[PDB]
Amino acid sequence: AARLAQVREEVTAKYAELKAKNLSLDLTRGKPSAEQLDLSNDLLSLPGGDFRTKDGVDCRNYGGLLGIADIRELWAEALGLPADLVVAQDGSSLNIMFDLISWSYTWGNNDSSRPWSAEEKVKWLCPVPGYDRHFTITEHFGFEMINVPMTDEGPDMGVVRELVKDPQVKGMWTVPVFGNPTGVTFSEQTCRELAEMSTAAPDFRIVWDNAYALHTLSDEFPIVHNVIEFAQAAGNPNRFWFMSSTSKITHAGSGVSFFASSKENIEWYASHANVRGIGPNKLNQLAHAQFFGDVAGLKAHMLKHAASLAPKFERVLEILDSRLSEYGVAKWTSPTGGYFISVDVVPGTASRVVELAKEAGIALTGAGSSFPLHNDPNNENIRLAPSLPPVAELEVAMDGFATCVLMAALEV
Amino acid sequence: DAARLAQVREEVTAKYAELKAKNLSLDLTRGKPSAEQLDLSNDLLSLPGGDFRTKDGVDCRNYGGLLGIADIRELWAEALGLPADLVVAQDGSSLNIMFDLISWSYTWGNNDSSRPWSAEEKVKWLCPVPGYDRHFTITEHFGFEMINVPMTDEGPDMGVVRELVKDPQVKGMWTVPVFGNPTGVTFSEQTCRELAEMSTAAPDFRIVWDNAYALHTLSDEFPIVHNVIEFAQAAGNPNRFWFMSSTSKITHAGSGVSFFASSKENIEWYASHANVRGIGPNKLNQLAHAQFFGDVAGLKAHMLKHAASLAPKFERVLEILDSRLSEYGVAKWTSPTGGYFISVDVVPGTASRVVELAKEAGIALTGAGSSFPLHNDPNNENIRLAPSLPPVAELEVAMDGFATCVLMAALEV
Ligand SMILES: [Cl-]
Ligand SMILES: [Cl-]
Numbered sequence: 001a002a003r004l005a006q007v008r009e010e011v012t013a014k015y016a017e018l019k020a021k022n023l024s025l026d027l028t029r030g031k032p033s034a035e036q037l038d039l040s041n042d043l044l045s046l047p048g049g050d051f052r053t054k055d056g057v058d059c060r061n062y063g064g065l066l067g068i069a070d071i072r073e074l075w076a077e078a079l080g081l082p083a084d085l086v087v088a089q090d091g092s093s094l095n096i097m098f099d100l101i102s103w104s105y106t107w108g109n110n111d112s113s114r115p116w117s118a119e120e121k122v123k124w125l126c127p128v129p130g131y132d133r134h135f136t137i138t139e140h141f142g143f144e145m146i147n148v149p150m151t152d153e154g155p156d157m158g159v160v161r162e163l164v165k166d167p168q169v170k171g172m173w174t175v176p177v178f179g180n181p182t183g184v185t186f187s188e189q190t191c192r193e194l195a196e197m198s199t200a201a202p203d204f205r206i207v208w209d210n211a212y213a214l215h216t217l218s219d220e221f222p223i224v225h226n227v228i229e230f231a232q233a234a235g236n237p238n239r240f241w242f243m244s245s246t247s248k249i250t251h252a253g254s255g256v257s258f259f260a261s262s263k264e265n266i267e268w269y270a271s272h273a274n275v276r277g278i279g280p281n282k283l284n285q286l287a288h289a290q291f292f293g294d295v296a297g298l299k300a301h302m303l304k305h306a307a308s309l310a311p312k313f314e315r316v317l318e319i320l321d322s323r324l325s326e327y328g329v330a331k332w333t334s335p336t337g338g339y340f341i342s343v344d345v346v347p348g349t350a351s352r353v354v355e356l357a358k359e360a361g362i363a364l365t366g367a368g369s370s371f372p373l374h375n376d377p378n379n380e381n382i383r384l385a386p387s388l389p390p391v392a393e394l395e396v397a398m399d400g401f402a403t404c405v406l407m408a409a410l411e412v
Numbered sequence: 413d414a415a416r417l418a419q420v421r422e423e424v425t426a427k428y429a430e431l432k433a434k435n436l437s438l439d440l441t442r443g444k445p446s447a448e449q450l451d452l453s454n455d456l457l458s459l460p461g462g463d464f465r466t467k468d469g470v471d472c473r474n475y476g477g478l479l480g481i482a483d484i485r486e487l488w489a490e491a492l493g494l495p496a497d498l499v500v501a502q503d504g505s506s507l508n509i510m511f512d513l514i515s516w517s518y519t520w521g522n523n524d525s526s527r528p529w530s531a532e533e534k535v536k537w538l539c540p541v542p543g544y545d546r547h548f549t550i551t552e553h554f555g556f557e558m559i560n561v562p563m564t565d566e567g568p569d570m571g572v573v574r575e576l577v578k579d580p581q582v583k584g585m586w587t588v589p590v591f592g593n594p595t596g597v598t599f600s601e602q603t604c605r606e607l608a609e610m611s612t613a614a615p616d617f618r619i620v621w622d623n624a625y626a627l628h629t630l631s632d633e634f635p636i637v638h639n640v641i642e643f644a645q646a647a648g649n650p651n652r653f654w655f656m657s658s659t660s661k662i663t664h665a666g667s668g669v670s671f672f673a674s675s676k677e678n679i680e681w682y683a684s685h686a687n688v689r690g691i692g693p694n695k696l697n698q699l700a701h702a703q704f705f706g707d708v709a710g711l712k713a714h715m716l717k718h719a720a721s722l723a724p725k726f727e728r729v730l731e732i733l734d735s736r737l738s739e740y741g742v743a744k745w746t747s748p749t750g751g752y753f754i755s756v757d758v759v760p761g762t763a764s765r766v767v768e769l770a771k772e773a774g775i776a777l778t779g780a781g782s783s784f785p786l787h788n789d790p791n792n793e794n795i796r797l798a799p800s801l802p803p804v805a806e807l808e809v810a811m812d813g814f815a816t817c818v819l820m821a822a823l824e825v
Contacts (some may be wrong), residue, residue, distance in 0.1 A: 025755060031474055031475050033472065037471070040473075041462065044460055044461050044462065044464060044696070045458050045462075046460045047457060048457050048458045048460075049454060049457065051454075051457055056445055058450070059446070059664075059667070060450045060453070060457075060664040060665070060667065061444055061445065061450060061666065062444050062665040062666045063666070068792065084636050089543075090503050090504065090692040090694065091503070091693070091694045094689065094690045094691070095689055095690045098688065098689040098690070099689075102515065102519065105519065106515070106518065106519060117519070117530060137688055138690055140685075142704040143449045200628060217703060223503070237553070246626075247475075251472075251473040251474070251475075251696060252474050252475045253473075253474065253475050253476070253691065253693075253694065253695055253696075254472070254473070254694040254695060254696035254697060270417040272553075275549055275550055275553045276507070276511040276512075277506055277507050277508040277512065278546075279506065279509065279666060280666075281503065281666065281667045281694065281697065282667055283457070283664055283667035284667065284694065284697065316659070338638070358762065373643060377612045
């Protein structure tokens with residue numbers, strides 16, 4: 001191992017050379033770049049004096065709880081769902097997912113014998129690495145979260161099947177297409193099993209958070225599996241709460257959110273929503289419907305995002321390969337869509353990699369942030385977020401990240 | 413009163429006879445702005461356009477910001493005379509926030525709770541009546557036991573409120589403190605002061621100070637917006653008030669912006685849950701509203717345009733009632749100088765009959781009891797009128813028909 005003393009010397013030299021660049025970069029922001037945002041500049045002036053829906057309804061006034069037909073029909077077609085199964089709300093699907101759990105907790109859902117608050121304990125399945133904002137909701141509700149391994153075609157179905165036999169298990173978080181942060185899209189097989197399987201809880205819900213349903217890096221769109229109709233045809237019609245939104249399509253924060261589910265789930269939702277409010281922002285929905293025009297226009301707009309994003313992911317992936325490959329030090333996802341790359345480093349070092357990057361002026365997401373309670377049991381995983389920075393910055397940041405990964409690896 | 417009212421017997425049978433003949437299809441039901449009012453805000457439909465940054469230069473197109481952009485907070489706060497750091501601006505509906513406040517207090521308690529309201533055997537809630545059906549529906553939904561409080565020319569009967577709050581099961585109160593829906597009354601300063609000063613048995617008692625009509629005057633003069641958050645601070649009950657307001661009847665109803673104002677402690681608590689619910693509200697719509705109004709003067713100028721459109725409509729119904737019911741002592745009615753409604757108390761036991769007679773003659777009146785918890789007006793006497801939407805032509809036939817229905821139903825008891 002005279003090569004070990006040589007490699008840690010050349011790696012130490014690269015870390016010193018990295019510190020000397022006096023960087024200030026971050027691979028932290030899972031949001032659209034200004035370039036991507038500029039693609040929706042026309043939406044900022046809409047709807048103007050064209051404030052009526054196709055059908056002739058004045059969107060400037062009260063009324064309509066489930067969103068306007070113009071946007072609901074457009075969006076349902078794009079996802080391949082029937083329009084009456086799709087609800088359009090305000091600018092956050094996270095808002096809806098919280099309400100869905102909040103209302104199950106307070107009142108029970110339409111399949112509950114008792115509100116989830118009346119249970120001794122509530123357990124919740126958490127496929128990992130996953131989305132911190134998901135886990136924050138179930139943590140806030142005091143649900144006992146149970147981690148479930150991700151495979152390359154979705155969650156470990158041998159684990160899901162065994163765990164769901166526990167009647168305290170009330171639900172599950174999923175990101176089923178171009179998943180945050182892993183990039184995997186659940187196979188049809190996996191989609192069908194989740195719809196078919198028996199659960200001990202009679203009111204088990206899967207949050208099918210389809211955030212990236214249209215969000216390709218290439219020329220091709222993923223299939224959106226109609227899990228709702230798998231559910232119906234399998235005898236479990238109410239199993240999926242199907243989420244999607246325009247946050248990373250238009251303006252992240254001032255977009256349109258969508259909830260799709262069975263008829264009975266939508267009626268349950270509405271019975272509470274009806275109390276909470278008169279209904280969503282119809283003028284924003286109209287503007288969005290006018291802006292996309294049709295499914296064809298939506299998809300055209302998705303391919304411009306693709307164009308902006310694709311070179312960034314390609315650069316990142318080549319640097320990971322070129323800089324880390326021969327070493328046997330890291331594995332990473334090669335997503336074909338979405339907003340993220342998930343990297344697994346030498347177990348026990350993820351934390352040190354992040355600290356080493358910070359000290360060299362590169363900001364990385366805190367190790368374990370893809371996990372419930374921010375705890376990665378193996379201390380191996382780091383999420384990368386390449387959507388915002390210019391490719392020139394990504395190159396430097398990603399050089400350094402690779403240096404930090406190797407430094408950490410060679411410090412034990 | 414009942415002596416001369418009878419002498420008008422056949423003549424009234426006629427009016428109705430005649431009125432049914434006209435084959436009407438009118439509606440006094442909608443607390444919505446007219447198309448003419450909505451038009452006032454058409455410029456806002458094209459905003460912000462290429463002007464997508466706040467004044468401090470923050471890009472409103474991307475994620476971030478939980479409590480609303482400074483531009484709108486600062487402007488609304490100034491308009492209400494409140495500290496901008498105690499004003500929160502959210503999405504299109506303040507009813508949503510009122511629901512969230514109550515919901516989060518039911519699930520996890522509020523910052524002053526020792527236990528969540530869901531763990532209580534009973535939760536009691538003070539309901540000044542006549543009041544607002546969407547308020548009452550929220551507390552009905554949570555299964556609260558609602559107790560009616562008499563409303564006076566200057567707010568709730570405080571002798572009643574002060575006795576009731578001695579009960580630790582009483583958790584809170586619905587109020588519409590300026591140009592109240594449906595009564596038109598604005599709580600006097602004294603009443604505002606008693607509300608913040610009184611001691612309650614519940615340590616976590618909350619008043620929903622739903623200031624939906626804080627600026628919505630029918631004249632050229634604006635009402636005083638008493639700073640109840642300050643009152644409460646000085647009275648040593650700093651967290652009592654959840655102060656609500658909205659642009660719903662100012663810009664576009666349902667696509668506007670809502671505001672929650674409170675003590676700092678109440679906002680931090682609100683933020684710890686709202687932080688879990690989402691990243692934050694629609695900033696671009698907040699920016700468009702901020703650019704549209706421009707300043708407080710711009711906002712108040714626009715309210716006066718609303719006043720312009722609404723005043724002749726309210727003036728009309730009030731002369732139609734006075735000149736057409738006053739002599740008979742059959743109905744009493746509010747004469748509001750702002751807000752959206754007129755509340756009429758007809759002879760006890762005939763309200764439902766009035767609504768019925770009107771419906772048959774082709775006029776939609778708000779359901780009897782709908783200003784009361786559980787839609788129960790125990791005297792069957794109150795009807796809510798909503799003059800805002802119809803053109804003065806439609807309104808004038810409707811108000812004459814209505815006054816006929818009151819006269820018919822009285823000849824029935
Ligand atoms: Cl089911
Ligand atoms: Cl207090």
